[PDB]
Symmetry: D3
């Protein structure tokens, strides 16, 4: 009965995120993608849909929204592990501070894994920015997500 | 002879990480001034008087440390009090590259030195901002703050 | 034939920037300083002021020119028939973010980014820190070109 | 049937290592501590004994020695995950390079987890050095290990 | 006008990460010299001639790039050839702080500039040393090295 | 009453080190430069040479003294009734390792470590890089005190 939570705002989910989801799904019996309710581009419902569409081939993964402390989200589902992806530009020092705080207040472990090099420079924010000015980010997002992004811009 | 250093911050609220730095500064310098920043824009959770009071309660055993508020250029605060050293603490999550930039700038414009000290591992992941955030949602940060600060913090959230 | 673009908001240009401009001008046949303007946030200096301050402090570099733009840097670069960006490094540079942007810029447009460390004397000035220090009276005269310093004090007063 | 490998030379195992072992053991069904055969202080057999003694309360953990590529060690046991601890002084950039190489050549994922703050500054090398000159490292090593270290020095 | 840069290393053997840097330098400078270090102490896997040959095969499409061996101070190699720029690549695992130190030193003693460029993500985790180590134990690094280098490497291991 | 120890192998002392010595001497009542010797590896300079080069370049600091030692730094510090180390930071400093050692030193002996950044002009010299550069003829005269430079060239010849 192993399991981990993969947190984020995912506005929108990128192939970097999906790579991490797939690795978590391959190494834990159960994975929950935790979508933060927090001024963004997609609604929570749209963000969940896009992740669900992109993870249809991962039977042991589900997608849920949440608010407040991540460790409460994790513990209320009977788990005590977080899997977080690393990419170029991740503020790792801040992630370490939060990992140590999260272990202290709730006994939740955080496992970090590097995203694949091909997806190591995409972020939700940079993808939106580049797409806004007509840059081609189609190789960096799930095909579904890419078309919905184009819709939001145009 | 008379040595001295300034320990700067907003301290909203003071944490055990801050206190650890205060104690080390007070042990190594004849005089220490904790400089509490007043910021006219972003008003935090505690007033400047409340922040000073919380620092004074926490540093009651440090006779050579005093607490003062201030505004503007830190190196002016320092030099106005006849000193020319700043002691700053490092924790997990400190933007150290930015701290180094500011240290080199402060040396250049006013001849003030900056000494960095790492907080104890037990207190290395607390920050004022993260403590407030965790406490707001009912997380237990009582092991990371002075006892009286924790009491006051619970009060401000109700 | 060779050429590079040196990008920034330059609000105002510092001696750190000028050091990088000079090195690029010495190593490439042409250099274009790209003054990138955000149409949705005014800086301290207008575009014409920014360009004027750069021109006055680069007058001894015959192969350097200054132009403003907005939107994607790689479009600015490519529309001028170039394929290289030269970016300075200083103390406090978010290099991980710069690397992310460099890899994205190469991916979307085939543009290369070359980083160069600014001289130690100029390694701790930034436009933002110079403005902050000068706002509260600190002496930044040694860190900014003559074309900038008193104009900066002017804006603050 | 989840599982991970925790690699090292462990010469000797520290409480920082043990903290990582315990977290891996809590989050994966099976954990293998992989002890490198590589000029050190303890023999491979002694290093294994010390880890086994220190992990007696972890029923799903075993300890084995090995040589050559770590990913071959991992894959030959039917697993494809490595759990590696982080401490103050870890050369993380090099660990990331190796993680990306290991994923490329064998499809093995590497999960990084920060050791507890109390154990974040001990290393096998620094513990030996300090102990050699009479420094007290008893709070940083398993009680068994500490006494055997004293034996090797005296 | 005539611009130029030197790309230094031991290249034992050259990798696709190196080649990526070579290609970018050759695209941006009128002339590029790949400088192959001879070290009298630590003799690696390939002789200097073999290393030069492997680089030349890999750079056959770069007419403005040439390969030369050298010894001693890199800035002397650079200045002796009438140049004053070095182009160095960055990958995962590069000791960048040390590279910055050396760049500032090289500017100070000889007025030589150093331009850093990040290798493509696909080639960002290969290094000469790690490629040899993985290959020695039968790992497949053929996607990370030029085709002829891979062939030669398999030969040296038998 | 107050005091700090400035440790290193100082083989040879650089202007980066001297900058740190001067700042410590200005901020503490006494400063001891601790020349740490490895009995199992000879450096370029003997202990007496190292100490002599430091004394000659610190003659204008009346509250600084120079002593050699070996073994645990914290024993050197504590046996002199002190409890503070002052260590310089430069470009290329392995700060993560320095932090690890600082936390260990606090744990085993209660000794505090204060880090200070050396001046930008001296931020890229190290004993090791100065020796390497000078070995192959590079000019490091501006990075080392007069007490060192020609003695260094002497050793290399
Ligand atoms: O930082 C996050 O990504 C985050 C995601 C959450 C997702 C669901 C509930 C709480 C959450 C808290 C977070 O800090
Ligand atoms: O950044 C600070 O912590 C700071 C504190 C001050 C405290 C008193 C006066 C000026 C100050 C300036 C600062 O930048
Ligand atoms: O780096 C290691 O810690 C390591 C441990 C091993 C342990 C057993 C077999 C191979 C191994 C290879 C390694 O690189
Ligand atoms: O570090 C190097 O890669 C290096 C290469 C050289 C190549 C040719 C001549 C001198 C050289 C000096 C170096 O430090």
């Amino acid at each position: 009965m192993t399991g981990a939570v993969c947190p984020g705002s995912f506005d929108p989910v990128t192939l970097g995120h999906l790579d991490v989801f797939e690795r978590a799904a391959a190494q834990f019996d159960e994975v929950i993608v935790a979508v933060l309710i927090n001024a963004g581009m997609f609604t929570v419902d749209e963000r969940i849909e896009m992740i669900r569409e992109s993870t249809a081939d991962l039977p042991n993964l589900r997608v849920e929204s949440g608010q407040g402390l991540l460790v409460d989200f994790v513990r209320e589902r009977g788990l005590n592990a977080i899997v977080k992806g690393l990419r170029t530009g991740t503020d790792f020092e801040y992630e370490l501070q939060m990992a140590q705080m999260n272990k202290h207040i709730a006994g939740v472990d955080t496992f970090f894994v590097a995203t694949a090099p091909a997806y190591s420079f995409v972020s939700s924010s940079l993808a939106k920015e580049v797409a806004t000015y007509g840059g081609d980010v189609s190789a960096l997002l799930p095909a579904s997500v890419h078309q919905r992004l184009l819709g939001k811009l145009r």
